[PDB]
Symmetry: D3
Subunit: 304 residues, 6 copies
């Protein structure tokens, strides 16, 4: 009744999930034609099944999105009973408002595409902005890495009881004050005027940079400089979505991060070989549980 | 081709906008029946017209909201060419996410209601969260009070070049840094844990609390005290939307504000009689200009940084 | 699997319904903020449940409608399996046509709002016009109070065998001729030219004014005058929806109604203290049965 | 910009409307294939045009209906600027509620079909139930035959000032009281239980049976007898839509009507050859005027009480 | 749980289907009023049932389509759990593109009508063009008569091992080369320049004209002439949809067809009396199986 | 009122079309962020404008497709009056049926995506299957390369009056018979079973392979050999869409074609440097004319048989 399928190539997360549920991943013939078109073939009947498609990480977002959309649609027209898109890192999430510009709200576009492709339900982790749930008319379960991160901080930072949770930018304020509050420690915020300004106290205390995602890590790496200058004992960076593209990985080594922690919502095994300070929090149990619970009509909020 | 209607009763804003466009407000037969049901009847043909309906202010939200939806509906089935909802302060805007709860995203519900009623276009001012534009599939013009605010600051606060812009909560960080950067001054931030923590320097500077909206004012009042305790010379509060429900006017009369500045997106006239700290920025010209441009197909973005 | 929730404050009907089904009403934190906005919080998981929201009667129709809409939506995005709005008295039902005016069809608006809020199913009683079922694309079960009213007439009017069922206006013709036919008695109709005209026979016979609803009762009260003048032995008024707002309750005492009968689709307990002639027909069993039967895939038409 | 097309065949009404607008009917290649499928091909560009399609009358409803939907479809995907369905007599209108049965609301189905085919606007005359406007989300203009009827009465019935307007059923009460009030005369009402009961005074007065439509005429014929038995001097029947299917023309030839008056919303020419009681009010001017106004963005409500 | 209903009058197929499933056909009061309007009344509760409406064949396509639409809608508003339209021969299928003209895409119109009427699922046989499945957003199971036709050819044509499958027109190429390939025999194609051109080899070999449907049979009958002229031993015509309207039946006798084979997707019993060469392949088992399998969440592709 | 934008980068076609209309391409800020996400920002107001977005050619389909959808989206919420997607070669067009498999109908998915993004109109050239117009509910103009092809043949092949038009597969039958009939010449057909069978006469005639698109060219290359073996004097291949991915240019350099003719619906400039057999028909005038007509409300059908 429950069927789990994976996006192209990136199967490690999807395999971890299927394992925890006692299932094998569904058969699918996924490829790319010589001329770049996404080719998909669901290799088994999904008629009347509860289907979960777990998003791939070939690091080509548009190919990954089209592949997801094609699979949702194939399952829908093959009379699956229900189709859930499981999308740990939601594409174009950062493009969720116009911001004074004549820009697309791409995240709303993506929501509409998933909807028209035929998704009945979304499962995702740490949406860039919670309002993104408002982009759908179908139910969205938005899981949080927060509890997994708190656990890690307490269990890996000896001075965590007097540390400071720092936001790389102005927008990240709500996220850090939530974490700092849970830990009962100080928070501080960085703003790029360029010159970086710091408000709050970091002097003679462990500083933990917390952000939802880091791409090129330009901001996260400058942030670490400023924090050192301001007398931070040691600096950590915690990101739930480790995109780490471009100069990201080199800047990280070239920076003073005692460590950089991410979840495996994006595949990290390649980069970990090229970056010693990276540690991954496995989130496959959270996702498996959300699927199992979604499937059984059981409470998901429990994982929040 | 252009036609402007007012929701019920608080017709001031509606009248100021119509005046600035050279128009009379359209005729409406708009009562509430014995059982509390909204009555409407568009008293003139709107056939083939570019219709703008301005949300009425009497502060009873569900009535104002239903009245607006009914008028949108009425104009659409009477074959208006286009129907734009002009909603200076967007209802249920503070209900735009789940916040780890089994809650409605009521702002999305409101957007869906406006959509099915038949709105083709929305004009609003300072959405509580910009993502709310993402709640519609029709175009939304979200005007800013910032240019009018920056102007008020520069012309009313002698020490503006040395002031600090302060957010009363963590969620207002981007809004205040944006103002601080434009003015080229400092910003600070208050975070409520039953205590407030302040980060950023305010000592021996004028502090300006800037928020999108103030309701019961519990927060801004405590923020002022906190700011004075941290050494602020004096304290201003500048809100775009002055809801001021319940005990707010009493909290303001007693608070250590030098002044509380709000726009007239929400009617303030009666509130001002009981509260001398309240000053009002008129935003009718910005709304009037957004309507005029929308109707002409002219750039509306000009107003995002420019007071007309 | 079945979950029943009530609208704000008005719980008496909703409680009667939940009792007959052997259920407790679902937990919900409903309130109104200082600034008039409707605040709702579903206080329990409704995931995979068959949910019925029974409409409140705070007598503020717009607050009651918004509260209903918010609750439907909250249940939908919390992955309820099905959401039914149970709405004994359908708001804006009288606004169901333009009637030569440039008016809204508000009842169609309300249907659209409920639909977009995410209702899968409607249960209602005595719609002002049956065409209102046409306003939805989702199924509507429109229950009738007719059988409950016939029972009451036979059991409370000694002369019912030679009485006359009278319609207050021209529009109510179909409703009364149906009742008069079932009873095998005379019907008559009133029209407001103002001066009231009466067609049909009422002389020396019990006259029963039957209407779907009465608000201010101005029409129902003038009607009773005319009927007396025309030689009605005694006059009764039967209304399925007793709104009774404004001068309604006083005009009723000030009128010659042997009695005024209503159902409890709208809360009547307050007004009954202020009006001796009012008697209520409990319709909670009809509604409970419709819910139970809706839930079990059992026939509802049986109650018609 | 204005373009008018006729459904199949009964092109009279369509031609009268086009004539009154100064137009030729648009070219259509419109046959029915060997297997009973409708064929259409719009014989001219409609790109960017204000298109009106007038429903054809041949009385085979499902064919007329499918033909209309296919032409709506054809014009929309050929990029017409707007497509209006002109449907003098609305199909399945008597199927607009469930009536305590497991029945379709076929009129709602028809509305959905017209909508998905791509109609932007509907123009119709005397919907069987006004609520049918509520079946669409697009605007509907529901024109009335009343002004044309009132005029016919005043000019053809000497005793109109002392007549009685009579509804043949309980469902027509509002329609007849409306006419009676305007004329300032009496109204009465027939209710069929296998017997008819009459309420209201008709004695020694001319009785005018007024209904929205007559089909087999079983009812109006029995109503006439009933009215004469109650002392009516003579009896008229005035319908807006003269369906007259099956044995109707035979029931009319034998009935005690002085006259049976219908509009030409349904073609009557062939029926009149076999029935001398039938007179026809031409409604093409009302339709022509509704189209002209719709196209110009001019008030259509004027016609609700005013014969053009 | 499974309920099967039939379109008007034409019950033979629908009865065959209901038999194979061990069911009686559902009660429905279907008729045509004096004034041509389709009258339907579902004569039993379908609440919570899995409903299949099998399309009638009164040979009046518009009446058959409206009747189907009305029945789908009636079941939907009576809270059927699921409604499938079973439509062996899809109306307006030949009107599925503009073809350089200002024509309707009627097949898309029909798809939209069925969808808005409330169909959840379509079952059909040999769509004129497979892209027609693209006209729906709901699942379509498109059954093939191909296997039934191959069986018949092998079992009724002695020379089938060296026969030629011939397409009446250019458009039918894909269909015949598929059949010819499966049989491992020759294919040929006819084109109307009018004068008919033939490409491919038919000399001294049994020629089988294969087409998805034949209406007036003008094309199929001229085709047979040309094939004789080209030295075809004997000519057969195989059509899955035998419409056979107008001069069709007479032209067939007047032609040299050793036989004309059709399926019973359209009622053939009347015409078979007037045409000796007609043989029907019963497809009621294929349809019953597709319904049963659709109902049980079982694989349908198996029948392909 | 008319505004033309180009997708990313392969801006040639876009520029040729804009040139022919007398326009400059609209300003776009269009990059791809570090993580492969498409960036767009319409660099000018499109408010109230008739917007045409021309699909960019860089051949990475999912990126081109997402870029197009994002720009459609951007223009619609910036209140463009209308947004038309100009998609010379329609993506996933070869995925427009199930083919007895559990496959997506990806072309229908693409249509749905274009629709929800907010396209009001599509302009395309030679859809792989005409039924694809049936995948949209908005109007689609599917232009033909045939008139330009017929012209190329008549002016470049001396023996065109005695040539044979050949389909490389069973699915192209209608397309080649259509060309053969117009030219009044023969047609033939290849069907791949691992072998090819040819039906129709090509002996001692020039053979012209005509297809909608060529990708890896495996098929057309084998078809040429087959055609020469059957006695064709020489062999041409004429495609509307020259995808030429993977080993195609190498298959062409080695194949027995006299010439391979393609339109510029797909950019060919770089491909031509490595392949001297390739000639290019410019279709920018046809696209330019379809846009101009669409904007003016003028007949577009003229181009279906007439090279502008």
């Amino acid at each position: 009744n429950i069927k789990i399928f994976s996006g192209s190539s990136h199967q490690d997360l999807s395999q971890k999930i299927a394992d925890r549920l006692g299932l094998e991943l569904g058969k699918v013939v996924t490829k790319k034609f010589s001329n770049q078109e996404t080719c998909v073939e669901i290799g088994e009947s999904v008629r009347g099944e509860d289907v979960y498609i777990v998003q791939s990480g070939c690091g080509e977002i548009n190919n990954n999105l089209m592949e997801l959309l094609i699979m949702i649609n194939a399952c829908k027209i093959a009379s699956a009973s229900r189709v859930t898109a499981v999308i740990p890192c939601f594409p174009y999430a950062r493009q969720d408002k116009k911001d004074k510009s004549r820009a697309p709200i791409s995240a709303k576009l993506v929501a509409n595409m998933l909807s028209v492709a035929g998704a009945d339900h979304i499962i995702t982790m740490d949406l860039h902005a919670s309002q993104i749930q408002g982009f759908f008319d179908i139910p969205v379960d938005n899981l949080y890495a927060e509890p997994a991160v708190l656990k890690w901080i307490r269990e890996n930072i000896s001075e965590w009881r007097n540390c400071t949770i720092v936001s790389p930018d102005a927008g990240g304020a709500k996220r850090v004050t939530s974490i700092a509050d849970r830990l009962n420690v100080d928070f501080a915020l960085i703003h790029k005027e360029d010159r970086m300004v710091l408000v709050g106290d970091v002097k003679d205390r462990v500083a933990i940079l917390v952000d939802d995602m880091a791409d090129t890590c330009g901001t996260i790496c400058h942030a670490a400089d400023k924090l050192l200058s301001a007398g931070a004992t040691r600096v950590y960076a915690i990101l739930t979505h480790g995109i780490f593209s471009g100069p990201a990985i080199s800047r990280i080594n070239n920076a003073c991060f005692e460590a950089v922690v991410v979840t495996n919502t994006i595949p990290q095994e390649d980069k970990m070989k090229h970056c010693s300070k990276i540690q991954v929090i496995d989130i496959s149990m959270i996702l498996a549980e959300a699927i199992r619970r979604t499937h059984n009509g059981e409470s998901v909020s429990y994982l929040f």
